[PDB]
């Protein structure tokens, strides 16, 4: 595998969307997995639509604005045949009527593979050969909300109790030693304001720090 | 695997 991997310099990440007051991560974190999914198969960057998945997956088993999974986004994805644009399905953060469009699709999956629960090296093996993966984090902490840069450490860190969804986007290491300082690249839906840019650098190789990888999961389309 | 919270 490769020292580090960023998705973000090869065209597979758009840029950072606020998910603003709505329980709604875990609809960026599916739809930056597929945004990353599709690229990877036409060549376009196409921003998918965060609010078709908060007002049509109830079925199966999300809560909108009160929270959901991205497994079960990608399986709405897959029943439902299909997911809009986010130019033509907006977001605006409230549980909303279900406007699902065939016509504006854009993008469609079969199902979805996990990763090993609780295996780093699994994760590190998906960001290096599929692209950007969704995975759930425990981001219920004051150091979270302020985090502004550096490798970010949480002693009050949970790797199996997790609040918050997010995008893996790819791993580094500070240093020119490529076996220490590790870190995963993850992207936020607080905002380009709020982090660094937006993102974060979690610790990696650090005992599964926040739980990045015990549910981590991507579309296959 | 993670169903103890929902992930908001
Ligand atoms: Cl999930």
Redesign the interface.
């Known amino acids: 595998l490769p020292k580090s991997v960023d998705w973000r310099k090869k065209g597979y990440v758009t840029p950072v969307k606020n998910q603003k007051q709505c329980?709604?991560?875990?609809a960026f974190?599916a739809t930056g997995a597929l945004e990353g999914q599709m690229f990877r198969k036409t060549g376009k960057l196409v921003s998918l639509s965060e609010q078709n998945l908060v007002d049509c997956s109830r079925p199966q088993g999300?809560?909108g604005c009160?929270?959901?999974?991205?497994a079960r986004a990608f399986q709405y994805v897959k029943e439902n045949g299909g997911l809009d644009s986010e130019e033509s399905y907006p977001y605006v953060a409230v549980d909303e009527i279900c406007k699902y469009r065939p016509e504006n699709s854009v993008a469609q999956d079969t199902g979805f593979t996990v990763v090993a629960?609780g295996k780093e090296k699994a994760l590190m093996k998906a960001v290096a050969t599929v692209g950007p993966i969704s995975v759930?984090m425990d981001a219920g902490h004051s150091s979270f909300q302020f985090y502004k840069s550096g490798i970010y450490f949480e002693p009050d860190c949970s790797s199996?109790?997790?609040?918050?969804?997010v995008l893996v986007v790819g791993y580094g290491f500070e240093g020119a030693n490529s076996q220490n300082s590790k870190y995963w690249l993850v992207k936020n839906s607080w905002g380009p304001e709020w982090g660094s840019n937006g993102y974060v650098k979690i610790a990696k190789d650090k005992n599964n720090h926040c739980?990045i990888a015990?549910?981590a999961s991507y579309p296959n389309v | 695997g993670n169903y103890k919270e929902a992930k908001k």
């Not at chain 1, 199996?160 to 969804?165: A, T």
């Open positions: 329980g709604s991560a875990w974190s999300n809560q009160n929270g959901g999974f991205m629960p759930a199996k109790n997790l609040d918050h969804g739980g015990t549910a």
